[PDB]
Write a protein that binds this ligand. Structure first.
Ligand SMILES: *[C@@H]1O[C@H](CO)[C@@H](O[C@@H]2O[C@H](CO)[C@@H](O)[C@H](O)[C@H]2NC(C)=O)[C@H](O)[C@H]1NC(C)=O
Ligand SMILES: *[C@@H]1O[C@H](CO)[C@@H](O[C@@H]2O[C@H](CO)[C@@H](O)[C@H](O)[C@H]2NC(C)=O)[C@H](O)[C@H]1NC(C)=O
Ligand SMILES: O=c1ccn([C@@H]2O[C@H](COP(=O)(O)OP(=O)(O)O)[C@@H](O)[C@H]2O)c(=O)[nH]1
Ligand SMILES: O=c1ccn([C@@H]2O[C@H](COP(=O)(O)OP(=O)(O)O)[C@@H](O)[C@H]2O)c(=O)[nH]1
Ligand SMILES: *[C@@H]1O[C@H](CO)[C@@H](O)[C@H](O)[C@H]1NC(C)=O
Ligand SMILES: *[C@@H]1O[C@H](CO)[C@@H](O)[C@H](O)[C@H]1NC(C)=O
Ligand SMILES: O=C(O)CCC(=O)C(=O)O
Ligand SMILES: O=C(O)CCC(=O)C(=O)O
Ligand SMILES: [Fe+2]
Ligand SMILES: [Fe+2]
Ligand SMILES: [Fe+2]
Ligand SMILES: [Fe+2]
Ligand SMILES: [Mn+2]
Ligand SMILES: [Mn+2]
Lengths: 700, 700
């Protein structure tokens, strides 16, 4: 049994990047002893991401190995650091090294790189990997010194070619007992083997398994174009996220805060923008520490911004509006906003927030800052769907792809802080990072690629992780796809596409409490119920939309009311069909009035069918009253839309068989009474002003 | 001006017949002085109704005229009496006689009778009547004596031929100044002039006008086959019936009573016979003075007679039943019944009453006896129609005909006691008349003519008036036309043909009071009303009819009830359609339930449409309960059909939204509640016995 105190891990790292730090954490988890070569030095090994190079590693390792040239008691494993994680213990590692019978075991990979012609010189291996990879090897310090001491080439010469040629010397391969880990018992290179690697979960740690060879590798190497696949595995392996411990590096359970530049982007017509702008005043972060930048690209939203701007200017430290008249593209506005923070050394954090992001968690900005990441996004999802503001994987084209764990993350089956290839709509970036690692202005622009993808590609090219937290519930994403802007109040038509936000804006705030009991619902007349249904904003916008149409009913107009053996009881009104709001209003009936009626009339069942839905206008100068009649409905819904006293004087609804009068209606409240046989009723005359009501004859 | 004290009317009458008495009344009305010749003598003038004769009148007049052979101061008018009425005063009569310039004025008629060949010998008259009639003449006593003294022929020789031949002597016609009343200024003979005579009304008397000659005759002579037309006129002229005085011989405004033989005839299956038989016990006449004879021709009615007979035998003086097993024809039974009274000198009055005659006036028999007529019938009419138990006129065939005043009599625009040609269904005949004037047994039989017509013809042949009183409301006539006897209780199906009698038998006695207010209707649960609808007999017969059908509902049977989003709520029941009672039950709904629902739910209007009408049977051993549900109706009718306690133990109807229970239903009473939305309800389990209810889902 080889003593783990005799094992030393050597790696190379010119800077403490997130990948290197991820490597060290995995090393410390298993109590590995790591020696890092080359910190602070300038990397002269060339663009190893694009071509060959890396000889500076061999030079640095050769110098280091002269100390141990005679240390036959020492085992050394050289590995990369930026794209390597450790999945197994030193004890298991040494046990497997001894089992190999090798004196210097190199990792094996599928490709013969960089010289593909040398493939013939390699020994024939049946079913395992055949060729050498220089990203990881392990052997006796004496044997390794005899190999690396022969380095005498340029810092930008290829390291793997150097080891390959020495390994292809049959006499040297035999003299020193060199070997390759063909079946990935110790080293797992990802390039050319993605379909062979799966995560193997344990209670408080995660590994990988090679299903081709049925092994559990110690070293996971995201070599070549597999950095993002290694990013995925590194979210779990070895103690990233565990079934019983949860994530292993997030905050989990949570004097001046850092100054922040908040950039808000309005790049398309988006619903509920006044609500979004009002919410900015409610973000739980000291506003004197926040500078606001708002780019509005829509003339449709200029009135919305204008209404909010006095409150925003009075609220935040400083404000800046870039309107549609600047003719800025989205990529130019986002480059501008980010560079305003980049060129300001007092900007410690950049917070980018799009208009379709609804932050229900007012502590979002705090939470993300405490995570102490370079880049981090809150997970936002569209209500009741899988679509959200991040990607778990990339197609080969670098386009959208669904990761293996995407649904688990979106459904918050697994929560934590996740290294992901793409984020959007909301993210917090460290100002230091913009100054030191992404100093260019063309972050979102510069190519024909979509700006939000160029942004993410810009950071992946620099080795900057893009983090995503679902540790908390942060909010949701508005549907903006086909937002019909040709209305006086377009958000009235948003009941289908954005129902949660529609309910918060238009359904009465005390509606849901009334539906749960709690003694809000009243019964002013025997079988006539009274409950809050619409908010004041819904009433005001519906009335406005009606008057904007203008074409109220006149003579010859017929309604479905029964009085004295006749249906000749008309009202001056507009039907929802005329204004194209019937489908929308029928949805309100199914979702909100139906369940209320079944609660108040136990035993009755409804699907809220209604052919007759209309807004009535009473006025002393045209039609102020409505004579006694029955409704052609099983039950009738009657919603007030303005204020008695302020907007009109005059009575409301009289139920004759009960001598019971609703004399003081309440604005967003609805009456619910039977339509036939029992509740013969009358609309009392409006004597001053104008009285609006919304009526539906449901279940005719 | 000729003194009316010089005028003497002479007529002939061997018996004080109704026609003679009618003549004398008209004579006394105008203060005429009448000398009647031949009373008590045997009539030897032959059958003047069938052929020639009447010379006995001329012989009797000749003897009488010898007293006045020299009385030039005296004017004498000879007229018939049995078929003559006087329509004018002696003063007007003498004024017209003088105006004629005649010394002996004979009446004129259209026909030259009895020798038609003598027509050529008559003077030519332009447009008036040409030939002589011996039924009336007026002249000086000296001139008349010179004519009648030449009589020397047989008692059965023709009187009119005698006068005609003397009138056709041109020298004698000239010597004595004989004339004919060509234009009916004084005498109106009806034969051949019916289309010329109309009634002329005054305030307190009635005349006739000749529209051909525009005259007002003094004497109306129903000569030949016009006796019945004279009967019609005699109902008015001169003071029979007047617009301001009413009838002039009826009682108008009304110690042992006469003994009566009451003969009841059941010659066809007739509805409501048990009610008819029960009514016999309620006729307001001392039953110890009444003998009952009942002829039942229908085996269908034998059980009905059997049930009633103990009460009838105990009630009346004596009773006699002739059943179907005697095989008596209607004419034989009516001959038998009438002859039982005829051969019994203690029978002072005969009262014949048919089973389809409903006497609503329990004083009928008294009223008719007080009228002191030989024959008299109460006017009975079929409800809401003109058909009734008399004819006003006869066709030439002696068949049915509508008289000019028939509708006025049936509608009781004119009331009185009327001389009519035909009566039926109910009449009171003086026993003396049967003994002395109609002694034959074959009154209804003897020919192929219908028995009821033979009866009336028998009396008209004897000169017996058939009287009809509409002076009071006496009753009605049942429709018996198509009485469907193939039912367990056929009278249940009589709602159309006999609705007044159907209502009295089957509709609850206190229903109509409840419909007029009076605080019978109850409201045991909020909008659930409770009123009496059916009588106990209706409930018992409907249940019996249901059990007699027997085929109650079982598994797989579906009803129109809504519970928990489903229509799977069945009852063990029978639908009215299955037993062929739906049309009948829908008529009950329209007539009785509809108007009640409109009274209790002001504003609602109904035509009582119902596809779902059925009787439910609850039993502990099959289906004792009915789970909570809604009804597929605007409102629901729910009628109990038996007694809680006596017939079943267990609850009734529970309305869940009100915690209101109808725990003690009342038999013929009905519940009336809404069917939808508000009155979710349950049928509580029947724990002992059997519970029947009648349900209708009206206005679905
Ligand atoms: C919803 O209900 C709350 C509480 O029941 C209402 O709040 C009250 O508002 C009145 C004036 O409108 C105040 O006088 C009370 O003090 C408030 N009570 C509380 C507990 O805050 C609220 O107004 C209701 N919402 C709407 C739209 O009517
Ligand atoms: C119709 O109403 C009358 C009176 O309202 C009912 O007669 C009463 O009957 C009860 C017993 O049933 C007696 O105790 C009372 O004395 C009666 N009152 C009178 C004024 O006679 C009659 O029962 C009702 N008819 C039906 C079929 O229920
Ligand atoms: O600027 C650099 C680039 C490279 N490296 C080290 O050199 C190794 C080789 O780089 P890379 O993993 O990107 O090459 P690949 O494995 O894809 O061939 C990295 O893991 C780092 O340990 C470094 O220290 N500084
Ligand atoms: O039995 C009789 C029949 C006849 N008359 C009288 O004779 C008249 C002639 O009879 P009738 O009127 O029937 O003959 P007609 O007018 O039809 O020729 C009657 O009016 C009676 O006055 C009579 O006294 N006894
Ligand atoms: C690592 O070493 C420390 C002693 O410094 C020990 O407490 C810890 O349990 C070790 N961890 C493992 C995984 O062996
Ligand atoms: C008939 O005579 C009486 C006198 O006895 C007289 O009172 C009556 O008014 C007279 N009637 C007529 C109609 O002349
Ligand atoms: O005026 C009211 O509140 C009642 C109006 C009404 O009942 C109707 O619209 O049919
Ligand atoms: O049992 C009862 O009285 C109620 C029965 C009922 O409601 C029905 O027949 O539908
Ligand atoms: Fe309308
Ligand atoms: Fe209404
Ligand atoms: Fe049924
Ligand atoms: Fe029911
Ligand atoms: Mn590498
Ligand atoms: Mn005559």
């Amino acid at each position: 049994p080889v003593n783990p105190e005799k094992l030393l891990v050597i790696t190379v790292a010119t800077a403490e990047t997130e990948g290197y730090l991820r490597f060290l954490r995995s090393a410390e988890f298993f109590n590995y002893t790591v020696r890092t070569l080359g910190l602070g030095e300038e990397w002269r090994g060339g663009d190893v991401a694009r071509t060959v190079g890396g000889g500076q590693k061999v030079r640095w390792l050769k110098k280091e190995m002269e100390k141990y040239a005679d240390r036959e008691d020492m085992i050394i494993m050289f590995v990369d650091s930026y794209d390597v994680i450790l999945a197994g213990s030193p004890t298991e590692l040494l046990k497997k090294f001894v089992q190999s019978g090798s004196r210097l075991l190199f990792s094996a990979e599928s490709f013969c790189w960089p010289e593909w012609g040398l493939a013939e010189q390699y020994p024939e291996v049946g079913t395992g990997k055949r060729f050498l990879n220089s990203g990881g090897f392990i052997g006796f310090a004496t044997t390794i010194h005899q190999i690396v001491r022969q380095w005498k080439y340029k810092d930008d010469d290829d390291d793997q070619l150097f080891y390959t040629r020495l390994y292809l010397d049959p006499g040297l391969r035999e003299k020193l007992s060199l070997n390759l880990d063909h079946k990935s018992r110790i080293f797992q290179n990802l390039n050319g083997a993605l379909d062979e690697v799966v995560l193997k979960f344990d209670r408080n740690r995660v590994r990988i398994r090679n299903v081709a060879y049925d092994t559990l590798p110690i070293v996971v190497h995201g070599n070549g174009p597999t950095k993002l696949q290694l990013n995925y595995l590194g979210n779990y392996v070895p103690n990233g996220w565990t079934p019983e411990g949860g994530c292993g590096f997030c905050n989990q359970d949570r004097q001046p805060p850092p100054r922040v530049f908040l950039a808000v982007f309005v790049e398309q017509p988006t619903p509920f923008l006044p609500r979004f702008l009002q919410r900015l005043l409610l973000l739980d972060y000291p506003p004197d520490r926040v500078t606001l930048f708002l780019h509005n690209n829509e003339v449709f939203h200029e009135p919305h911004i204008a209404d909010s701007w006095p409150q925003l200017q009075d609220h935040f430290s400083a404000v800046k509006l870039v309107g549609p008249e600047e003719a800025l593209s989205p990529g130019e506005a986002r480059d501008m906003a980010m560079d305003l923070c980049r060129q300001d050394p007092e900007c410690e954090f950049y917070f980018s927030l799009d208009a379709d992001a609804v932050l229900t968690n007012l502590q979002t900005l705090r939470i993300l800052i405490e995570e102490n990441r370079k880049v981090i996004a809150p997970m936002l999802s569209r209500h009741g769907k899988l679509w959200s503001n991040f990607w778990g994987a990339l197609s080969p084209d670098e386009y959208y792809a669904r990761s293996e764990d995407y649904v688990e993350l979106v459904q918050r089956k697994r929560v934590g802080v996740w290294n992901v290839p793409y984020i959007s709509q909301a993210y917090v970036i460290r100002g230091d990072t913009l100054r030191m690692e992404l100093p260019q202005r063309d972050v979102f622009s510069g190519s024909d690629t979509d700006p939000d993808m160029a942004f993410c590609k810009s950071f992946r090219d620099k080795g900057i992780f893009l983090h995503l937290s679902n540790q908390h519930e942060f909010g949701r994403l508005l549907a903006t796809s086909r937002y019909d802007t040709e209305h006086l109040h377009p958000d009235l038509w948003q009941i289908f596409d954005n129902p949660v936000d529609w309910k918060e804006q238009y359904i009465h705030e005390n509606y849901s409490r009334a539906l749960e009991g709690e003694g809000i619902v009243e019964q002013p007349c025997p079988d006539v119920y009274w409950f809050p249904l619409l908010s004041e904003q819904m009433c005001d916008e519906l009335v406005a939309e009606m008057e904007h149409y203008g074409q109220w009913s006149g003579g010859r107009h017929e309604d479905s009311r029964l009085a004295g053996g006749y249906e000749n009881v008309p009202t001056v009104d507009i039907h929802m069909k005329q204004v194209g709001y019937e489908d929308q209003w029928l949805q309100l009936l199914r979702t909100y009035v139906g369940p209320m009626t079944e609660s108040l009339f136990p035993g009755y069942h409804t699907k809220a069918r209604a052919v007759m839905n209309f807004v009535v206008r009473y006025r002393p100068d045209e039609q102020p009253s409505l004579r006694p009649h029955h409704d052609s409905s099983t039950f009738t819904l009657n919603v007030a839309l303005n204020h008695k006293g302020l907007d009109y004087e005059g009575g409301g609804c009289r139920f004759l068989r009960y001598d019971c009068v609703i004399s003081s209606p309440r604005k967003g409240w609805a009456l619910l009474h039977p339509g036939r046989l029992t509740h013969y009723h009358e609309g009392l005359p409006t004597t001053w002003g104008t009285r609006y009501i919304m009526v539906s004859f449901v279940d005719p």
